[PDB]
């Protein structure tokens, strides 16, 4: 058989591969670079624009644009370059051969799916397509049918409660805190220690400081006192040029804004209170199964100690006879792709695809008809 | 009462005087000169180093250092000489008598305030001190409680939105375009016409060509065509020695880099797009009041036509039902000092001072506790 | 094909030849001599003025003018004589046959290219022309696409950073220390030992003492102590008339002013600190590649030990995890010509030439339009 593609556009990373594989063939940043300086040498083989690992490699010459932000595609001519690179250069497969599966954050604009569909059939000429809610796929990955899923990548965070494969749309919470807003906060706070980062090519440095050094405090105000009193907590990092920077009590302050969006001036409650309020909107027969199956998903949940901090601060809210368990598998950065990889391999699914014969009759609005 | 001192270190200029005055007693460049040649005469009354109007007068013999750049104090032994000159020679007042108020650009390194505080209490022995955000003072000066303030001196530019005296820290933009980088650009571009300027003592000439001759085009590419086609725009200036230089289409190209930082190889957007993006980070109930109260502040906003160019190019971005007003008072070069002069005179403020009795208990870190 | 001429006017030397050759056909000093005495014999075949190797041969009778100083052409009626000699006498080729390529120091006056172009099309009637930045050609010569280039001839020194064939114009440093100011310093310092040299015809002697005897100390103050204490360092030279002079600790003092322009009363920093500051103006992602590819170019970099002195005194500034390499090929005096020889042979280049049909339409200002 022709296996289908699974392509988790996400934001910030593209994850792609064939259904039935256990990890993606292609993981590269969803970033398009254009050169800003004057090219002076002649015969250099100048190239209009760079995608992914190239734009990361040459980033010092480039201006880097993400075409997707908050799970919304904001520039289609970039995004189509990213798909073109994914199919032809990175997977080295012609998409006209076999179906494609795409993933989207819930509750985002209706036109985004119509444009994705129109591009997939018109330019890439895919034989059939489907789009699937990421947080649903995270359950397929973690091997469950009853869950509440905190799925948090770059761009967007959302909670979806699912009971025995019935989703509860009225209870779906979406929040726009994400790895990119922890990064922009880490930029505005590192400045306290004099370090400075003003360009995209070094926003990509701060993005990797955040990944290695940052961690989540099990209780915030005592570690704030500790690392204000003893320097033993602070750690140091070599910038690309060889300068050494040092980061102390800061390296737990940026991921803790997930629990206090007030630090960046948002009104809304952190991931713990939005998780609890999402459970509270569910009807009371299912709350015990939701409290047991809290599933972490996506990369922004990778910070050390976010599991124990969640279990603590939800147990501070839950009724004390209940039992609260946070399921944080180590693969979890890929779980949306793994779930889509198994979903697309199910023989039952093969009916679900939007085929081109349907699209040519109904137009791109068919998605709202046949998808979720 | 003992009136407090107001000392707006800024960069490039020092502005100082007593609270409740309407203009500063002391305006002199924040520049320290040391002699580089061999002194040959004997009995001359040689002097180690010169501050301010002296280093300006003798500049042909000296090397001129600015101790502050990009609003960061980089040499404390110079800076303390500048403060010493300010209190004892220029104001002719012992700072041990009465409090002092100091101004700083937002979002700059945390240690700069601690060092300023430590020097003010330890060496100058001031009874009480405070440090105040410049852009807040520009509103006190312009008589407003709701504003967005483009404050741009030597060293640094920043936007701060303020609504009814609540600042919105998440929306504070800081930019390192400034009068000094327009000056270094004017040096690298005047070379096109053969004139050359390689030393600090003539960097101080270029800094005054920029002040008199330069102006901002209401639309760039038509004046570029005009002054490429008609010489009628060009104007001439006498150097100190009596050589005449002539400057044409150049004299609008250097201040226009405020709107196209690409000319000096920065990524970031000009002052107009950073102002608009700062408004966009504010919540939508206040944007109409921010759009009405755009306040220009600081000397780098003095170029003829920068008001009309800002109002044009922000109106090009704002929704056309909104109303856009640029408030550019003629005093505006002094508005940060005028605002600090009124702030320090408020009877309500007298509680706010960091007193020495507090500092001796808490140490220099008390600033972060009691200031903003 | 008609091969193009490559004519690296430089200063002090003219280097010329055909594209695709590996060394120039013509290397002669860019010097014009006029006779100053009364000619007494009759029928001698007296000739108004001499160019190049003639003015060197007869120099005792002549006054020698360089028409180019600090990479600026200051006398066009001399310079056009030098070009006339280059094409017709030394290469023995009519320039009307095939294109010509010319080289210029960066950041020099805009009108110099317009005059060069106007003379090349109007008088020499060349079919096509181009002008190329010397420091770019030194990379073509050294076989690299990423570099920072310290190119230092007679007249002018400059640093140009180039990353993968993108130049970084904001980081281009130009400095007016050069072989001619080391020569005038060697004249003013040799007077210490009583020798004296006051005329151009013996400035051309000092220029060759500088070439043979001088060398750069790996550390200045210990060799200054050594050669003040032990005479073992001193070396002797025969003047043309047979007088022997002797030079001791002096012979390293003149080339060391490249690292301490204070010795000749300039403010600015030496070539090492200008190289480092040029790297610092570059963005932080590329600095490791700039630090690895430091390329020496031009004749003033020929002094023995300048490589090791540069590597030392840049390693004193660079972060200690970096690796610093100074690339000083033995040809390097010719590398700008070798680079222009390969550049002009590239088939891709043939579009780049300014053809006469373009010039006749746009006028001499076309250079700024179609060149770099």
């Amino acid at each position: 058989e022709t296996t289908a593609l699974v392509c988790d556009n996400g934001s910030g990373l593209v994850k792609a591969g064939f259904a039935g594989d256990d990890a993606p063939r292609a993981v590269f940043p969803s970033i398009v670079g254009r050169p800003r300086h004057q090219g002076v040498m002649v015969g250099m083989g100048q190239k209009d624009s760079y995608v992914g690992d190239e734009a990361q490699s040459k980033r010092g010459i480039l201006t880097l644009k993400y075409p997707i932000e908050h799970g919304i595609i904001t520039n289609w001519d970039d995004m189509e370059k990213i798909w073109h690179h994914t199919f032809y250069n990175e997977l080295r497969v012609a998409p006209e051969e076999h179906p494609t599966l795409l993933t989207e954050a819930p509750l985002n604009p209706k036109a985004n799916r119509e444009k994705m569909t129109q591009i997939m059939f018109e330019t890439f000429n895919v034989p059939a397509m489907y789009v699937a809610i990421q947080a649903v796929l995270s359950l397929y990955a973690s091997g469950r049918t009853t869950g509440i899923v905190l799925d948090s990548g770059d761009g967007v965070t959302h909670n979806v409660p699912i009971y025995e494969g019935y989703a509860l749309p009225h209870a779906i919470m979406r929040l726009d805190l994400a790895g990119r807003d922890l990064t922009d906060y880490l930029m505005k706070i590192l400045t306290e220690r004099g370090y400075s980062f003003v360009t995209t090519a070094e926003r990509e440095i701060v993005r990797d400081i955040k990944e290695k050094l940052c961690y989540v405090a099990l209780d915030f105000e005592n570690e704030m006192a500790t690392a204000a009193s003893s320097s033993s907590l602070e750690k140091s990092y070599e910038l690309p040029d060889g300068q050494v920077i040092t980061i102390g009590n800061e390296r737990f302050r940026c991921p803790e804004t997930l629990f206090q969006p007030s630090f960046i001036g948002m009104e809304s409650a952190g991931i713990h209170e939005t998780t609890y309020n999402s459970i509270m909107k569910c009807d009371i027969d299912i709350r015990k199964d939701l409290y047991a199956n809290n599933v972490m998903s996506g990369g922004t949940t990778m910070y050390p100690g976010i599991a124990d901090r969640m279990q603590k601060e939800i147990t501070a809210l839950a009724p004390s006879t209940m039992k609260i368990k946070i399921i944080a598998p180590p693969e979890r950065k890929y779980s949306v792709w793994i779930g889509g990889s198994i979903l697309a391999s199910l023989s039952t699914f093969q009916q679900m695809w939007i085929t081109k014969q349907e699209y040519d009759e109904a137009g791109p609005s068919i998605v709202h008809r046949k998808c979720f | 009462e003992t009136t407090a001192l107001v000392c707006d270190n800024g960069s490039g200029l020092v502005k100082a005087g007593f609270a409740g005055d309407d203009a500063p007693r002391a305006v002199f460049p924040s520049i320290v000169g040391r002699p580089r040649h061999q002194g040959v005469m004997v009995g001359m009354g040689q002097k180690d180093s010169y501050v301010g109007d002296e280093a300006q007068s003798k500049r042909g013999i000296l090397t001129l250092k600015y101790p502050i750049e990009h609003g960061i104090i980089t040499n404390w032994d110079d800076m303390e000489k500048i403060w010493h000159h300010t209190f004892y020679n220029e104001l002719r007042v012992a700072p041990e008598e009465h409090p002092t108020l100091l101004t700083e650009a937002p979002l700059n390194p945390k240690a700069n305030r601690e060092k300023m505080t430590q020097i003010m209490f330890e060496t100058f022995n001031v009874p009480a001190m405070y440090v105040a955000i410049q852009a807040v003072l520009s509103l006190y000066a312009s008589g407003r409680t709701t504003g967005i303030v483009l404050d741009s001196g030597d060293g640094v530019t920043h936007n701060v939105p303020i609504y009814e005296g609540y600042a919105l820290p998440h929306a504070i933009m800081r930019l390192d375009l400034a009068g000094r980088d327009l000056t270094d650009y004017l040096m690298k571009i005047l070379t096109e016409r053969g004139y050359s300027f390689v030393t600090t003592a003539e960097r101080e000439i270029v800094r005054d060509i920029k002040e008199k001759l330069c102006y901002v085009a209401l639309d760039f590419e038509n004046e570029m065509a005009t002054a490429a086609s008609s010489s009628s725009l060009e104007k001439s200036y006498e150097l100190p020695d009596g050589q005449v230089i002539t400057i044409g289409n150049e004299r609008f190209r250097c201040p226009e880099t405020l709107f196209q930082p690409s000319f000096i190889g920065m990524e970031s957007a000009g002052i107009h797009e950073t102002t608009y993006n700062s408004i966009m980070k504010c919540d939508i109930d206040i944007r109409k009041d921010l759009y009405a109260n755009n306040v220009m502040s600081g000397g780098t906003t003095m170029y003829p036509g920068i008001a009309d160019r800002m109002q044009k190019e922000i109106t090009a971005l704002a929704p056309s039902t909104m109303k856009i007003k640029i408030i550019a008072p003629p005093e505006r070069k002094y508005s940060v000092w005028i605002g600090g002069s009124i702030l320090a005179s408020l009877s309500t403020f007298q509680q706010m001072w960091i007193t020495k009795q507090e500092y001796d208990e808490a140490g220099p870190s008390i600033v972060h506790r009691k200031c903003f | 094909e008609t091969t193009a001429l490559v004519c690296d006017n430089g200063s002090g030397l003219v280097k010329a030849g055909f594209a695709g050759d590996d060394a120039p056909r013509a290397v002669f000093p860019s010097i014009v001599g006029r006779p100053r005495h009364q000619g007494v014999m009759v029928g001698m075949g007296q000739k108004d003025s001499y160019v190049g190797d003639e003015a060197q041969s007869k120099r005792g009778i002549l006054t020698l003018k360089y028409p180019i100083e600090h990479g600026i052409i200051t006398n066009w009626d001399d310079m056009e004589k030098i070009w006339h000699h280059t094409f017709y006498n030394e290469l023995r080729v009519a320039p009307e046959e095939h294109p010509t390529l010319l080289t210029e120091a960066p950041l020099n006056p805009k009108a110099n290219r317009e005059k060069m172009t106007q003379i090349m099309f109007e008088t020499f009637n060349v079919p096509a022309m181009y002008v190329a930045i010397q420091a770019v050609l030194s990379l073509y010569a050294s076989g690299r696409t990423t570099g920072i280039v310290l190119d230092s001839g007679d007249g002018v020194t400059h640093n140009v950073p180039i990353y993968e064939g993108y130049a970084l114009p904001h980081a281009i440093m130009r400095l007016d220390l050069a072989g001619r100011d080391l020569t005038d310093y060697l004249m003013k310092i040799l007077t210490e030992r009583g020798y004296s040299f006051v005329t151009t015809a013996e400035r051309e002697i000092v220029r060759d003492i500088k070439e043979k005897l001088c060398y750069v100390a790996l550390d200045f103050e210990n060799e200054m102590a050594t050669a003040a204490s032990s005479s073992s360092l001193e070396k002797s030279y025969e003047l043309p008339d047979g007088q022997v002079i002797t030079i001791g600790n002096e012979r390293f003092r003149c080339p060391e002013t490249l690292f301490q322009p204070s010795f000749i009363g300039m403010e600015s920093a030496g070539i090492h600190e200008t190289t480092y500051n040029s790297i610092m103006k570059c963005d932080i992602d590329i600095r490791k590649d700039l630090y690895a590819n430091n390329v020496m170019s031009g004749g003033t970099t020929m002094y023995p030990g300048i490589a090791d002195r540069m590597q030392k005194e840049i390693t004193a500034l660079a972060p200690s995890t970096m690796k610093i390499k100074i690339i000083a090929p033995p040809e390097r005096k010719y590398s700008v010509w070798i680079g222009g020889s390969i550049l002009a042979s590239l088939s891709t280049f043939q579009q780049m030439w300014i053809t006469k049909q373009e010039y006749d339409e746009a006028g001499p200002s076309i250079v700024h339009r179609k060149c770099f």
Partner: peptide
């Protein structure tokens, strides 16, 4: 500054 720039 201490890193991103010269101050």
């Amino acid at each position: 500054w201490x890193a991103x720039c010269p101050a």
